């Protein structure tokens, strides 16, 4: 991959993890 | 003419405490001053020291071409008196 | 180099460059040995009687061989007032 999109893909995936973990505050 | 300065020896490490020895009373400064006085009508324009292969060290002094008439025939007397008075070999020269 | 009894166990004491005093190696093929004939006062070349100099390949590669020959010949009298100590 371009690696640029792979890091961005993880960034979109880190964002999802943070919001989901926030549900059970 | 030469000046009679006083020479304070370099104190030992275990020697007692005294006044601060000024740098004027050091060995090198007084020798330089008497060397400069030896050629009073002229003025020194440079000093060189030769470290020959044998180990002995030979001084050389560059004098101005001005007033060289006043010391040119007394080069030898200056050399011998200074060598007696200090212990170092000095060879005067005017670059001309 | 000599042994305990004094015999010279060294084979091939090598030559040294006349300009830089470096040792000329056995395969330094850029090194040369200039032989210059002696000339008598009649202007004749004396047969089999030469002044010989050796130059290392380093000096020849650097182009300093000409000035080194100028100095060596002037010090040996082969030349007069062509090489100057002060530049």
């Amino acid at each position: 991959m371009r690696d640029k999109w792979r890091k961005k893909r993880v960034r979109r995936l880190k964002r999802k993890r943070r919001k989901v973990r926030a549900r059970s505050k | 003419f030469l000046a009679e300065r006083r020479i304070l020896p370099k104190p030992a490490r275990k020697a007692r405490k005294q006044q601060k020895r000024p740098r004027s009373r050091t060995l090198t400064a007084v020798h330089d001053k008497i060397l400069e006085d030896l050629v009073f009508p002229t003025e020194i324009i440079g000093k060189r020291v030769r470290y020959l292969v044998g180990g002995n060290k030979i001084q050389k002094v560059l004098l101005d071409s001005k007033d060289s008439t006043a010391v040119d025939y007394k080069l030898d007397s200056f050399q011998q008196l200074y060598s007696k008075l200090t212990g170092k070999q000095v060879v005067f020269e005017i670059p001309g | 180099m000599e042994n305990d009894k004094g015999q010279l166990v060294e084979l091939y004491v090598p030559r040294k460059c006349s300009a830089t005093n470096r040792i000329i190696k056995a395969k330094d093929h850029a090194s040369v040995q200039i032989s210059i004939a002696k000339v008598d006062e009649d202007g004749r070349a004396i047969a089999g009687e030469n002044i010989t100099y050796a130059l290392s390949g380093y000096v020849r590669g650097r182009g300093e061989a000409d000035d080194s020959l100028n100095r060596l010949a002037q010090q040996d009298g082969l030349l007069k007032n062509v090489w100057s100590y002060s530049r």
Binding site: - | - | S31, Q33, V39, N50, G57, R60, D66, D67, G77
Partner: protein, 208 residues
């Protein structure tokens, strides 16, 4: 040292100055700096012809020290020096290499004209760069006629002269031939005029 008979004579100084041997190139390299007497305000550099003469005498003594005359190889790729080198070879017995120098003449021992000179004399290090390189491959000392911009790599004894002159090349080669023969003894002494004329050794165009 050297007898005073080896000094620059006024006659030779007249030939050299009339032949413009003393005219050196505009730009002088640091290795050729000792040979410049003064720079002419236009830009030309004046050659110390006293030093040129002394280098000529040193070179002739080196040539005279070689036992076999055939062991000296004289080279010239410039057209201005080909006739000079050919007449030099005829008069002195040296081995001439006029025109193109085949790369490998000193190192490749199966080539046709494979020679093993003990000494190589070159008209110009720039146009004869290949010959100097192989001499630096097979331990051959090099004598060179050098101007003030000529490179000095792998040249041991440099004769300061004008390499790009029609009369300079012929005169200098004639002078070398005269001195080598003077030391060898064919010519009885240093004052007798030599039979060969400096007009001979000069390159001739196909016109004349």
């Amino acid at each position: 040292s050297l007898p005073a008979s080896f000094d620059l004579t006024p006659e030779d100084a007249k030939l050299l100055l009339a032949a413009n041997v003393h005219l050196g190139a505009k730009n002088v390299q640091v290795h050729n700096k000792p040979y410049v007497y003064k720079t002419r305000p236009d830009g030309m550099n004046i050659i110390n012809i006293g030093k040129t003469w002394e280098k000529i005498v040193l070179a002739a003594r080196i040539i005279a020290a070689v036992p076999n005359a055939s062991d000296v190889a004289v080279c010239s790729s410039r057209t201005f020096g080909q006739r000079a080198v050919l007449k030099f070879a005829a008069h002195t017995g040296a081995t001439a290499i006029a025109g193109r120098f085949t790369p490998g003449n000193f190192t490749n021992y199966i080539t046709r004209s494979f020679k093993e000179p003990r000494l190589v004399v070159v008209t110009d290090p720039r146009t004869d760069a290949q010959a100097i390189k192989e001499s630096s491959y097979v331990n051959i000392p090099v004598i060179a006629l050098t101007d003030m911009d000529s490179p000095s790599e792998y040249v041991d004894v440099a004769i300061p002269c004008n390499n790009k002159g029609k009369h300079s090349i012929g005169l200098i080669w004639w002078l070398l031939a005269r001195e080598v023969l003077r030391l060898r003894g064919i010519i009885p002494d240093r004052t007798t005029e030599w039979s060969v004329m400096p007009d001979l050794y000069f390159y001739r165009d196909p016109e004349e």
